[PDB]
Copies of this chain bind each other. A is one copy, B any other.
Amino acid sequence: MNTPEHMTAVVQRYVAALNAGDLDGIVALFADDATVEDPVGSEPRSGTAAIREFYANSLKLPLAVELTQEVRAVANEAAFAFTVSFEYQGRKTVVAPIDHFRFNGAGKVVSMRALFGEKNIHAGA
């Protein structure tokens, strides 16, 4: 029923790839017809095309994600929480959204939805 090592490992490899800016790879990370939602209720994308479109418009910003908690892998599920370092307009900020990925088939992510709150961000300079 999906392992935490494989799942979590995927999340890890994904994070790295993310910081690497590997869109193609990141895309290959999950299904090809999967649906990503970042942040939330902000028009979810579907298909390596969309997934890439978003992930791209996202990376568009020079940020650095890093784990500061852990991952919540369960029934073909993997809901982990990570931080996002980004600074703009002489204003630094660090978010801590939660990525919720659901694997299907056996270990293929076809659905990905994040969870970011207002108090999940910490501005500063």
Q: Which residues of A contact B (CB under 8 A)?
A: 4, 8, 39-42, 69-77, 79, 81, 97-98, 100, 113, 115-120
Given A79-B98, A81-B81, A98-B79, does the pair A116, B72 have CB atoms closer than 8 Å?
Answer: yes
- Do A119 and B4 touch across chains, with their CB atoms under 8 A apart? yes
CB contact between A73 and one of B8, B75, B117 (< 8 Å): that residue: B117
- Do B4 and A75 touch across chains, with their CB atoms under 8 A apart? no
Can you give 12 contacting A-B residue pairs, CB < 8 Å? Answer: A4-B117, A4-B119, A40-B75, A41-B74, A41-B76, A71-B117, A72-B115, A72-B120, A73-B119, A77-B115, A79-B98, A79-B115
Q: B residues within 8 A CB of A74?
A: 39-41, 115-117
Q: Give the residue name and chain of the B residue nearest to A70 (CB).
A: B119
Q: B residues within 8 A CB of A116?
A: 72, 74
Given A77-B40, A79-B98, does the pair A4, B72 have CB atoms closer than 8 Å?
Answer: no
The distance from the CB of A8 to the nearest CB of chain B, in whole angstroms, is 8
C-alpha spacing A97/B71, complex, angstroms: 11
Q: B residues within 8 A CB of A41?
A: 74-76
